[PDB]
Amino acid sequence: GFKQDIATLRGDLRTYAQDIFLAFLNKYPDEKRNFKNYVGKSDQELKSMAKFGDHTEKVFNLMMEVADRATDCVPLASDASTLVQMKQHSGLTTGNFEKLFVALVEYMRASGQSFDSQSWDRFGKNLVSALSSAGMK
Ligand code: HEM
Nearest CA to ligand 1 atom 23: 59
How many residues are recorded in the chain? 137
Phi, psi dihedrals of residue 46, rounded to the nearest 5° = -60, -40
For the chain, the C-alpha Rg in angstroms (whole number) is: 14
> From CA 20, how far away is CA 16, in angstroms rounded?
6
Tell me, using a 6 A CB cutoff, whether residue 102 lines ligand 1.
Answer: no
Number of domains in the chain: 1
- The domain containing residue 113 runs over which residues? 1-137
> From CA 59, how far away is CA 120, in angstroms rounded?
15
The runs of H, that is alpha helices, within the chain are 2-11, 13-27, 43-47, 50-69, 77-85, 94-110, 117-134
Contact status, residue 99 vs residue 23, Cβ threshold 8 Å: no
Tell me, using a 6 A CB cutoff, whether residue 62 lines ligand 1.
Answer: yes
Binding residues for heme b: 36-37, 51, 55, 58, 88-89, 97
- Mutation probe of ligand 1 site: the residue of 86, 88, 120 with most atoms within 8 A of C-beta: 88
Tell me, using a 6 A CB cutoff, whether residue 121 lines ligand 1.
Answer: no
PDB experimental method: X-ray
Which amino acid is residue 6, in one-letter code?
A: I
Nearest CA to ligand 1 atom 3: 59
| Residue from 103, 87, 28, 17 nearest 54 by CA | 17
Contact status, residue 3 vs residue 123, Cβ threshold 8 Å: no
Q: Other CB atoms closer than 10 Å to residue 51's CB: what's the count?
A: 11
